[PDB]
Amino acid sequence: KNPKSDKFKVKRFHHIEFWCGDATNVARRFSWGLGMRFSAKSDLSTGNMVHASYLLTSGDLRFLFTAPYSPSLSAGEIKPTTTASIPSFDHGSCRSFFSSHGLGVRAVAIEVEDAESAFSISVANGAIPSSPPIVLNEAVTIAEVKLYGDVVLRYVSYKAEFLPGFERVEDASSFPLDYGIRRLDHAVGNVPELGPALTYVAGFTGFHQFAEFESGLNSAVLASNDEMVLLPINEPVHGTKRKSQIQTYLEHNEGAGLQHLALMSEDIFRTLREMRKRSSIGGFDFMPSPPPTYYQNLKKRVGDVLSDDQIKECEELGILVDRDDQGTLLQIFTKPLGDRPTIFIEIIQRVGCMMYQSGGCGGFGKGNFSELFKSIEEYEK
Amino acid sequence: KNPKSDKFKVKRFHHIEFWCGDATNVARRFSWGLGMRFSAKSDLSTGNMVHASYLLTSGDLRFLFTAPYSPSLSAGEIKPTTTASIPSFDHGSCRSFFSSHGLGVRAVAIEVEDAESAFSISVANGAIPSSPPIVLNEAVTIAEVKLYGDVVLRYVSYKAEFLPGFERVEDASSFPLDYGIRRLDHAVGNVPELGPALTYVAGFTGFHQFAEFESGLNSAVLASNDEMVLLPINEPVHGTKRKSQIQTYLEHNEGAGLQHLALMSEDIFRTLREMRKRSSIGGFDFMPSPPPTYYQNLKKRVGDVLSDDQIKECEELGILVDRDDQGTLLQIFTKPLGDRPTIFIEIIQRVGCMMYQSGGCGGFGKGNFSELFKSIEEYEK
Ligand SMILES: [C]C1=[C]C([C])=C2[C](C3=[C][C]=C(O[C]C4=[C]N([C][C]N5C(=O)C6=C([C]=[C]C(C(=O)[C]7C(=O)[C][C][C]=C7[O])=C6[C])N([C])C5=O)N=N4)[C]=[C]3)C3=C([C])[C]=C([C])N3[B](F)(F)N12
Ligand SMILES: [C]C1=[C]C([C])=C2[C](C3=[C][C]=C(O[C]C4=[C]N([C][C]N5C(=O)C6=C([C]=[C]C(C(=O)[C]7C(=O)[C][C][C]=C7[O])=C6[C])N([C])C5=O)N=N4)[C]=[C]3)C3=C([C])[C]=C([C])N3[B](F)(F)N12
Ligand SMILES: [Co+2]
Ligand SMILES: [Co+2]
Structure with a gap:
């Protein structure tokens, strides 16, 4: 709503x-x-x-x-x-x-x-x-x-x-x-306390909370009227055995700041081919690819949206896939852009929700946390 | 001596x-x-x-x-x-x-x-x-x-x-x-006063002044025993109508510091081809090339050392040539490496003085100041 x-x-x-x-x-x-x-x-x-x-x-x-x-x-x-x-x-x-x-x-x-x-x-x-x-x-x-x-x-x-x-x-x-990048889809902040951050920003913009659907974070997304300006915000979840990457961010950044920029591509496969060609010659590195298990489980989830070829292409490029009830999201994350483990970039492409495409089509990849944990224990089977 | x-x-x-x-x-x-x-x-x-x-x-x-x-x-x-x-x-x-x-x-x-x-x-x-x-x-x-x-x-x-x-x-x-770069040939400092800088460094190293042969500078070169560690130092010359680039350096750098690094190439033509290919896609830019006049005058100076082909190659890459009484120097300068008009890089190759090659063979390109002024007024003829 x-x-x-x-x-x-x-x-x-x-x-x-x-x-x-x-x-x-x-x-x-x-x-x-x-x-x-x-x-x-x-x-x-x-x-x-x-x-x-x-x-x-x-x-x-x-x-x-x-x-x-x-x-x-x-x-x-x-x-x-x-x-x-x-x-x-x-x-x-x-x-x-x-x-x-x-x-x-x-x-x-x-x-x-x-x-x-x-x-x-x-x-x-x-x-x-x-x-x-x-x-x-x-x-x-x-x-x-x-x-x-x-x-x-x-x-x-x-x-x-x-x-x-x-x-x-x-x-x-x-x-x-x-390489096919076309616009900023959303910009994500990390804060120590999500509630007061949300109250402040929504308070002065009138931005509303954007419809969603423990991995170290809680998060919410603020959106403009047509949901084309999108501003997710994260906070850490503490005492989780595996230290929260949000907390790590806050320590190395000396506090709150922008965590990542998600850049929409008109063709994420071309973009990732071109960026990966340059990773070792001055460009950007990417987070480790999910195991083949993750891709062996993608047919049962998005086999109606992507062909067996386009899913194989996802495997060779390490692309992640998640799905709303309205659209599908292709995404991948770079390693940190600089010396500190703070800011990084996400490359995305959204499929669905055509009227133009409506904002946030497919969500932000929340389901890819649990599916990554599933593919990790399924790969060690 | x-x-x-x-x-x-x-x-x-x-x-x-x-x-x-x-x-x-x-x-x-x-x-x-x-x-x-x-x-x-x-x-x-x-x-x-x-x-x-x-x-x-x-x-x-x-x-x-x-x-x-x-x-x-x-x-x-x-x-x-x-x-x-x-x-x-x-x-x-x-x-x-x-x-x-x-x-x-x-x-x-x-x-x-x-x-x-x-x-x-x-x-x-x-x-x-x-x-x-x-x-x-x-x-x-x-x-x-x-x-x-x-x-x-x-x-x-x-x-x-x-x-x-x-x-x-x-x-x-x-x-x-x-791209063919193989070692650091020399490292050049800019100071407000050349005399006291020379007295200080030569004083504690025992480095000696290296044999040479108004463009806004005076300079001298300190050298180790085998003249393989080479440390030129420049000072500005003031009141010259055209402001001294040494002075400009000192102002933008907030004082003395390293002006340029000269990097020896085993094949300066390959190095410049490869660097110029990348100038506009993340690499380094080069200073403006000398006019064809400069290259039309190179035959009468180094026509015994470089062929008519290798001199044409110098023209397409913008390479400068100077000559000692013992060897020949090929050189070119990058634009500043960063935001400020301070540090830059020189690419060099030295020809001659074989015993191994002795240090500083061909000098440091001092003669290229007057030859550049000559080629400028000869080009406007
Ligand atoms: C610290 C840590 C985290 C994880 C997942 C692991 C795990 C591992 C698994 C895969 C891997 O490579 C792939 C990779 C790793 N990342 C980095 C972490 N991240 C994300 O930041 C992430 C994300 C999904 C969506 C988004 C967004 O857009 C967001 C939000 O979230 C909030 C709402 C709005 C937004 O817009 C973001 C930032 N998703 C799935 C994710 O995983 N991205 N791709 C690297 C490590 C692991 C194993 C199996 C063994 C060890 C030792 N580890 B291990 F401890 F190193 N480890
Ligand atoms: C400010 C200024 C300087 C000059 C020469 C000009 C002139 C112009 C002519 C060519 C040009 O492009 C080519 C270019 C321009 N540089 C930049 C300046 N430079 C050098 O720094 C230079 C050098 C030779 C050797 C070395 C060394 O290694 C040194 C030393 O010296 C000290 C001893 C030890 C070392 O190791 C160094 C640093 N040589 C020939 C030189 O020229 N390098 N290549 C760019 C401009 C000009 C014209 C015709 C019209 C205008 C308006 N201008 B204008 F005012 F912009 N202008
Ligand atoms: Co995101
Ligand atoms: Co030099």
Whole structure:
């Protein structure tokens, strides 16, 4: 049941911003590993004396990578005279974030009808302000409120090409990589306490709980009116013999933060073939594949949705499959994106729920916890 | 003239250590961009709760990438009980270095006969101590003294496989990339004042000035007994209409530091073909190529050393050529390795001076400054 209670008009996920120590090296690694093109830049070459920011795109997916320059380059500037293209940026905030958390997501950005109104309504409804609305070149309005930990929910609204002050990059420097990723499906946070996190975020957005159906976690999913902006949140479950990966996350991250980004592929088999080709030559590694037992049990579950060929393809790529009462979900998880066992990526493809495809079709793979335990003891039989 | 005045026995360059915010992403970028294999690791998976360190190798070239974990992971440890594999590592030092300089070289490591003696003799002769000698697993001794800025000269000595506590990496995770790079030829520092820098380093090493033959710099080269460890140092020249790139370096780096690493290739044409193939897909970019004028003038200079084919190959790859009275130097420069206009890489190949090849054969490309200015005004003719 969807009460459609959004307190302001939300459109879609707009971009994700990583705070880095060196934006160049992270962006180049991610571009090769995920098949994303260099699309826009804001840095010294565009007059930005404050931060280096590079945008990667694949389909509608936008990854922004930002790092601070020496504060000395901009020490004569004041906020009215800043050369930063993202005026919410702060040298001290960024260094504090990165020294505390390592490489991770600073901003989950969603497009809204009116960022100034979204900010005002959010703060009026309990949101903790992070950066007030600012109009960029009379063209774009950006505002930020706290989401969890040091992650912000960033509102972006356009009167009418990423942000003012960003330049499109030279097509020679812009190689058209594409492994099939097309958009951000959902963004997942880890918190110490799920209840208060849910109460806070649902409180200021009006996002509603999304319909679901011990593995170390409890979780719930907050969703916008059309359920296209999806924000799952996890908490740890303690004293389980096998230590909760949520707890491990919280310790290595120094607290709450973004756990993973799920990226929708238009063809998950092509995406995984292309990413796995590059795992050992600069790209991303994947979690260990489930045993052949798991795939020997997939016929009895989704044999009506995937052929015997497409299930064999799942086995060679290590893809997981789960199923709602409305659709089917193909998913796989990368190993952590950086030094710490914190942030990772999920690749997904959803099958079903056509009207366009409705949001969250197939769920989020909850059933794959117990099926993994089943396949583990069935493999040792 | 070589007085062979080394105050202790120096062997060869051993490794270069980068201090990073995220060692994983920098190492993966560098591996793909330069064709270096993942060789050894020291990180959480090997019991290191202090820093993540990944070693890349190509031939005898060793690049180490290190970043700190949360200090909270090791807060119960003391130096006698540390899990760091490089006991000179300090969380505060590393964060201070990276916040001050961005991505850059922390350690220039050379192998010596006896690291404890090299440290003692160096400090007795004016070297500023950075980390005292420590014996690792009764097997390797490591000690550090200040070189310039926050760069240290690291002494490594073996009684008898990188360092104790480092594990060889899984061959599956270890793809045998190789673009032909084989060793570190020299490592170049930028300082505000060349004289006092030279007096200091030559003072504690006994390194001698290496034989040479306004572009914004003055420079000199310090060399070990057999001139295989080579350490050029630059200072800016001020008031030149065109601002000194050394000065620009010092401003963006927040002072003195390592400017570039020159990596010897066994086949610079293959290396540049392979690196340029990857420039736009995660690798490294190269400085703008010299005009065809420069190459039209190369016949009259090195037409006795390179064929008309090999000179055409230089033109398509943008390779520069210079010549001593003893040998010939092929060289090219990358764009900066990270966000800041600070550190970059040079690829080189030396032709001549065979006895083995003697160090510094062909010089360091000083003549390529004036020849570049000549080719610029000759191209506009
Ligand atoms: C620590 C640990 C966890 C598990 C499962 C094991 C187990 C093992 C089994 C398979 C394996 O490789 C495959 C793999 C391992 N992961 C990593 C863990 N994970 C997930 O994070 C996961 C997930 C399903 C959905 C999602 C989401 O999207 C979420 C949510 O959940 C909340 C709601 C909203 C969202 O959006 C997420 C994050 N599912 C199935 C999962 O398994 N992902 N794929 C690696 C290890 C094991 C055996 C047999 C023996 C040992 C010693 N271990 B062992 F202790 F290492 N171990
Ligand atoms: C700032 C600036 C510098 C120069 C040369 C120019 C000029 C231009 C010409 C070519 C170009 O692309 C090619 C390129 C540009 N670099 C970057 C600068 N560099 C070097 O750092 C360089 C070097 C030779 C040897 C070495 C070493 O190893 C050293 C030492 O030196 C000290 C002793 C020991 C070592 O070991 C080093 C670092 N050589 C020839 C050099 O040129 N490297 N390759 C890019 C720009 C220009 C024109 C025609 C018009 C404009 C507006 N400009 B413009 F102002 F952008 N401009
Ligand atoms: Co998910
Ligand atoms: Co050089």
